[PDB]
Amino acid sequence: MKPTYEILGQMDETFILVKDSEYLYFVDQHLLEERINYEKLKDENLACRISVKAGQKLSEEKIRELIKTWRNLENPHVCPHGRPIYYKIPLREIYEKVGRNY
């Protein structure tokens, strides 16, 4: 994700929505914190059990911290169990559907 980005907020207390100029990302808050804790601790089970879970409301500051750290991860793509940390949609798919150039 580009270094210029806009955090749109939380959805279903499970995803953080953040976009750059190319994609809208839906970042799984649990998988992201698990990856953060795994890269620090090198222990998959410990990283999992201490991380936030889906269904927890997160503050705006906590969300900023997580997204900032996400960009610096060695593996921002998949959690230690191999699940994708996020879903992304190209912004052009949204714009093109309504007939707009992007």
Residues that bind Zn ion (CB under 5 A): 34, 48, 64, 79, 81
Contact 25, 1 (CB under 8 A): yes
Binding region for Cl ion (CB under 5 A) out of 4-12, 53-61, 63-71, 72-80: 53-61
Q: Does 47 bind its own copies (CB under 8 A)?
A: no
Identify the three-state secondary structure at position 96: helix
CA 49, 18, 55 angle in degrees (round to 5)?
35
Find the residue with minimal CB distance to Na ion: 4
Which amino acid is located at 96 in the chain?
E
Site residues (vs Mg ion, CB under 5 A): 43, 45-46
